[model samples]
Target: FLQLHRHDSYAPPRPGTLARWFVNGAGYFAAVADAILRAQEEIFITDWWLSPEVYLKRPAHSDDWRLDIMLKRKAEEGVRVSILLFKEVELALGINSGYSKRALMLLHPNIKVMRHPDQVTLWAHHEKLLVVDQVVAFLGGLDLAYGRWDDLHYRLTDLGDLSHNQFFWLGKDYSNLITKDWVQLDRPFEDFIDRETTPRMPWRDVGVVVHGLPARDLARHFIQRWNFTKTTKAKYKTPTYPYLLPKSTSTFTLPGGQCTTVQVLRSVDRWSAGTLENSILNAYLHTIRESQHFLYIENQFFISCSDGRTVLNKVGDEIVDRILKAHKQGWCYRVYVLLPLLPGFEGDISTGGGNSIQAILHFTYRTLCRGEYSILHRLKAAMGTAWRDYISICGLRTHGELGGHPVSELIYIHSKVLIADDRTVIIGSANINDRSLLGKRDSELAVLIEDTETEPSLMNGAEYQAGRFALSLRKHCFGVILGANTRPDLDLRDPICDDFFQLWQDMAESNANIYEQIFRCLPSNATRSLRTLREYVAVEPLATVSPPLARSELTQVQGHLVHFPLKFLEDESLLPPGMIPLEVWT
Candidate 1:
């Protein structure tokens, strides 16, 4: 019932379970809609967090209110619905007084809601999934939050500023900002009551859907995590919801792809590479080798360089050559990534050498820049083609108030997704880091879909180009992050051009520029230009490095060895006395 169209570079996906790759918010949505529309019996939505308000259809199709409305409609139409969400501090505060206050509001007897709070110190709930009619499931790193909607058009403005048309509601403390009265975290819901100007950040996040064999594997992984988190039977209590489990639905097997055998990889195996099996690195490498006409990616982080020169010699120079070759092929190759405007608190490492989050992020950026420079140089050496032809990395950002929260004033793409054509989509939780690959820290999920020949994505009727909203987002992001987008209609390149980089630099510079204009903010200098990137990131040249300070002040927070790399060593008088061994652990 299926056929392969091998009119171009490579043959159609050989008959296999591993379909083509479709990675990004837009691709996942198309698949999610298809799965939901195909549902016949039951649906279960569970996650560490869920912002039941992001739009599904995007832009021109602004009428549908995404999951919340669709679920209600489905329940009314007689399909049983059950939703379970994490009862963590953040979600509790966001969902009212801790126990699904907002959830309890919507009910038709057929729909049920339950809260699963962590019962132990070492154990916690962290999973993202959606099971439809017991026949299909969606799991992985994609959270149901704001800002996850987008595609590859990578436009700046002409696509229409659809962010303003997003779905948002206003009421009580949940109305657009962190109103003081809206049950603050670590405090009771009834005590604090004050006039509020805003709520939390209302933006989009990235995630993926499941339908074939991969869906079942993701669901089982969820069960293992639940088993690990629960201490007693009560802690692992199953909610009395409409449906307890998923039922098998029809599976897709394309005629041209290799025989597919879905494998579930996870972080549970801390000492092994089992979790690294489906890592971003592996997925990226595979996507690169197989892609023919275009290679599109929509991710949250582009900071790591596992294959930098030191690790670079590990992979041949041909990889870079192939990318450039794809570029010379004419049709611009596109790579779209969405991250937070600035790095998150932890990601921000100060350029003043202060042991702060800005420092970490800046350091990472410096490292990434160095790696990218090396890659560009290597690409030039490997292929005799213009650098601009091969690849383009674009950032999508936004400013919005949704479900009663204020998003980062300048929106950035935070969703992590990678889609190759409309075939395979890796949408789950995995940042571009060793933590995600080493596997013990996160629980993620991704879907590999290649049978567009068997079933088409709902978003695009055919030829899985990044849809309207996605291109609109890319164009906007190009304006915000890259600065100037040449083709406001549809982005063709994947490389960050000179003009685009300038726009991003200017935006980063405006941090203090706009702040002072508003409230006469302080005039302290910030180190953010390329000059600082070189000066501040004094990479310890020698394999051996030391922190010239006492060991008492530093300690570990998570697994990544946290420490304050401050220039406090400049003050000799501040040094402590006693048996204070200096740099004991370093």
Candidate 2:
């Protein structure tokens, strides 16, 4: 039934592994901290961007939980700590990886950092992974950097009275990457969003920790990349970084009764891994095509669903095929896609957003609904208006009080995740885009998890045996978004039931309407053109005009669910100018 083949990946599927899912950065980082503290021999970390100052635990009462401080302590205790960060183009991206390397290496002699792919300029080493002592590995979309440590509440303001030392966000944590990129470590306050007025864009992400032989596989990947970087980028340097050998996975054993199957997947090419491997893309295609009941996807970018000329990955195509089959067979099926309301680039949508934001939005909309080859467009061509019954595209938003003012912001969905039929899941740093899935572009890593352990559950109003891990993770995500308090009677276990689908659509539409009435949120369907966006921004929202009324209306919003503005820029062409490479946006 599970159709993963050896040719699909470099790492074959390994059974008898244990996997734990982390829904957000807070839980994930805390787990990472505990694993790092328990490390006895080695610690390996790889990130696209790493900030040494991020706090693993929030309300950080002490510096011990800070990333750099913890690494220093672990290194001093004789653990060999190694880090690999993406060598970003300095002029375009402001993630100062050079500073990160220097700051980390200065702490202890046992610590070393390497920036990779010195020759490749366009693509990035976009994998986020941490392996400790070759026993446990954590990999997913959450980066060990500022602005990632958010909980289910998704706070919009963390500026407490500093005189009382009550601030939850310090320095760089109070960041809005869309407003300005973090350029340098020393200038923490440069281009900082005003904490007193603007609401911070809270992040929502997912990650997982794996144990047993699969963890060793992750470590092996790190070792390969580290040695390759040593050969290519640091071959002639003095006090040389030593080449690493893969640890023996023979002795690695999982505790009895753990029956999870894990296959480590990657997207690598000759420059990074000396060969082409695109198991991540293959896994997505196979799983989507084989899905029985439903599919849930939360990703940072959705630039697929093209004719293979513009976007290279066929994830969206596979999705359309599955939904179309379900429609024709008269089988109840659903696809829930949660993406960010706006691209996380420095732009204001109320004033016709910047080129970077517009360019990305263009491709995203094309992939989603507007273009001739989009998922919705193809589905609509076959099913007509009935397409709404199969798929629902959505975004997240939450409101809070900031300094005697009611403020709201979208919960930026930075997770790269897919859950199918409460049996299998794919979680990692690979986004659903050509850059992350093409194998020849940005390098990426992910894990395909198939559960062998099952629990009794309800599916389509019948008793079903659901994978324990996948079902729980899916429920946790649904409970967070649907507000468990408001919908305690809602049976989320059955995704294909009529009542469940209706409830999902109704709640999302209701929440979207409430937010529009209360806040006049941007990227709204009401403002399709630039002139209308300016006019929309000029009017004071109910939150500013009447806080009491806005609060009363906000009580109607049960969860952070909101509808994605499908018609925002329906008539406009969002493609960038001729000077920029099309692949940069893809």
Candidate 3:
């Protein structure tokens, strides 16, 4: 079973690449900002949304902190800067000319900013790419936008507390309506967050940094998209096309000190890749199928119908299919997912706040979830109750008494990340949804990473086991959530250790159970109660894992990370009623 269909066997291995896993935005921002500040020649960036006013470093001078200022300075110093931004058409509002405005009002002659041409109706140009001097690349779910920064120690209040500095970046919003104590969240577009946003939700996102030839691979991806959208530069009335855009022939390789193999994967436009190049989904399918034990995922949406074709073609169904097979074979396996409790908007399941979009999204995901469980139901009908052992789907949430009132925050998981059996990891901007995986809908860039040291010979039974990078990521995340030094023996250093795996599974499941209990205890008007329950509690000292700051015992667990609190039963199909017209969401 362990030898079953290794995807890498068919797909050639990544060569001579040095990759570093960045757990959260704090690490990613600090490193990437430095990279940008140090870039001597060129910088290329692609994003679904770009805010030039975002501060890369907190508590820094306005000159050094502001992104637009940094880029302008770089451009003036002769480093050519090119930016590709999605031309977002707000459905409720009219056309948005914000990016074009920024380019015209604030940018230098050497800095070229263009709105990418719309290839598909109802699709976003949603790839987050950052390449520096063609030498280093940053990838994953992070976009250089507002409401995107947070670390594992998710502090609820950041009013002058540099402690929140460890997380990532969140830019100043339109009105600066959200005070420092009130955390600004990531919305589709810039808006005024007022009394509606009280407990300041901390952002949870994932990203990575790569040095060596793999960086060049990401650079090529940016160039391709740049050239593809070349014709549309004039549509936005920009200056000459970027002369700084790396030529097709330009390539460079770094010194060979890294021990990882990397494959830069993409979901190119079906029109561009010639009929839906589903390489990202393809990579996900084979990687999950090839896994021996344990699959960890963090994604924004859980909307993939498992019964039939999903937005990603058939990638959705087969994922559940493989795990069911593994459980029937009596393997010790578990799937852990960290997802948002609800969609990240004011109107969660309603349309009152002009959030019909949220309603549609909730329905779409609920429908797909229902499709997945239908398969499990059929299997349970035939086999029995044991199918439940393979998957644990949960979302992260935190609540505490603020100002002596009950206050809670849902750590919005905006990450598109997957790590399989400690051997491989794929991190990028693509989510597990049709809009993302469907190449023509929203183009995406992801890199599949495999550690060379974690070879097959060390494997025992079905566990393929992880190497240094994989195990480090697992331990780092686990430590953050469980309290770094919560237990003496909970080192979590060894990836293949049965005891460690079981311990983590048990704790995560326990946390989920706690979440359900707390959730049920709240009233129908829980949001209001939570919001009004806004009284700041003192950051207490922790006897266990000591961070630089003091935190109460409750704060330690509640403030950091929590197990996602959703329940997965044998009846997994959770489709809600009355599917929205597909064209509406596209």
Show model 2 residue runs off by greater than 4 Å. Answer: 1-7, 161-164, 187-191, 234-239, 252-259
Q: lDDT rank, highest first? A: 2, 3, 1
- Per-residue lDDT tens digits for candidate 3, residues 1-586, read 1221223221234565677777667677777788888889888888777766667775444447567788888888998887877776644322243543465336788777767555445666778888998778888988876667666766554333333343232334322211221123323223434323344566778787777666766787777667666654455433467433443323432222347888777787744323345567778888878887778878886556543343334554565667677767866666766676555544422211223433434444443333334434444554576645655555666654434344445667788888877777888898877777766677888888887775332222343445656666666766665665656555544443456556656665555444433332211122222223232111222311232222232332422344432222212222233645453342
Q: Could you tell me the TM-score of candidate 2?
A: 0.96
lDDT of candidates 1 onward, in order? 0.40, 0.86, 0.59
**TM-score, model 1 to reference:** 0.51
* Candidate 2 C-alpha RMSD relative to the actual structure: 2.6
Q: What is the TM-score of each candidate against the true structure?
A: 0.51, 0.96, 0.78
| Model 1: per-residue Cα lDDT over 66-138, one tens digit each | 6666666777778776565666555323543243426433646666655554342222234567777533566
Error of 2 at 112 (Å): 0.9
Q: Which lDDT tens digits does candidate 2 get at residues 1-586?
A: 1353653786779998888889889899988988888889999999998988778887777777889999999999999998999988877788889889989999998898988767746889999999988889999999898888888988888766223456667877878767666655755433367888877888999999899788888888898888777767544244557667777878732222236899999998888777788889999999998899999999999889857577878899999999999999988889999999999988866777898889889889888888688888899999999999999999999999986758888899999999999999999999998999988988999999999999998778889899988999999999999998676887777877889889999999999999998999877888877767777889999998999889998988988989999999666787665555688879
